[PDB]
């Protein structure tokens, strides 16, 4: 039998845009224990609804109180460097608390200096 960490990335809300006459093309990356996964790029939105699920094999290493999930949202640029919008570290401790094996988050997206951007991230996490 498999053991995995699962995340449903619902949506982000109230994303910032530095330049409003430039189309905003949000894309999110989720990293757990160094394994990075990405959503599709949503075009023309600052309130993107991905509704994408992600699974990480735990690889025989159990979750612990300190385990965390990192999500970054950027504004995609084809020529190349994507523009950083905001990020969150999601503490997974709550997932271990009850027999639900899960937790729900509505997390503020912060800039690299931890200043809240006004945007938020909606997601559910669970494990087996």
């Amino acid at each position: 039998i498999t053991h995995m960490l699962a995340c449903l990335l619902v949506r982000a809300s109230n994303l910032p845009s530095a330049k409003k006459d430039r189309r905003s093309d949000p894309v999110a990356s989720l990293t757990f224990r160094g394994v990075k996964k990405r959503t599709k790029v949503i075009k023309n939105s600052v309130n993107p609804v991905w509704n994408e699920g992600f699974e990480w094999d735990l690889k025989g290493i159990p979750l612990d109180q300190g385990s965390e999930l990192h999500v970054v949202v950027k504004d995609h640029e084809t020529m190349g460097r994507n523009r950083f919008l905001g990020e969150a570290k999601v503490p997974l401790r709550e997932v271990l608390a009850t027999p639900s094996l899960s937790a729900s988050f509505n997390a503020p997206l912060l800039d690299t200096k931890k200043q809240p951007t006004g945007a938020s991230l909606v997601l559910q996490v669970s494990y087996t």
Side-chain angles (χ1 to χ4, degrees), residues 56-89:
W56 291 261
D57 175 15
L58 293 167
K59 300 180 185 173
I61 303 165
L63 298 173
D64 63 60
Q65 288 288 297
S67 304
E68 67 179 19
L69 175 70
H70 187 186
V71 189
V72 186
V73 183
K74 299 199 201 184
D75 177 17
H76 180 264
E77 294 278 349
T78 63
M79 353 260 103
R81 69 303 126 63
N82 289 353
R83 195 181 70 241
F84 172 94
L85 299 178
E87 73 186 340
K89 303 288 163 328

Side-chain angles (χ1 to χ4, degrees), residues 70-118:
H70 187 186
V71 189
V72 186
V73 183
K74 299 199 201 184
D75 177 17
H76 180 264
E77 294 278 349
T78 63
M79 353 260 103
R81 69 303 126 63
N82 289 353
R83 195 181 70 241
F84 172 94
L85 299 178
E87 73 186 340
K89 303 288 163 328
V90 180
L92 296 181
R93 170 170 305 179
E94 294 158 40
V95 179
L96 298 176
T98 80
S100 79
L101 312 175
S102 65
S104 302
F105 300 90
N106 180 16
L109 293 162
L110 312 184
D111 72 20
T112 59
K113 290 181 156 230
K114 313 308 177 200
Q115 166 72 43
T117 60

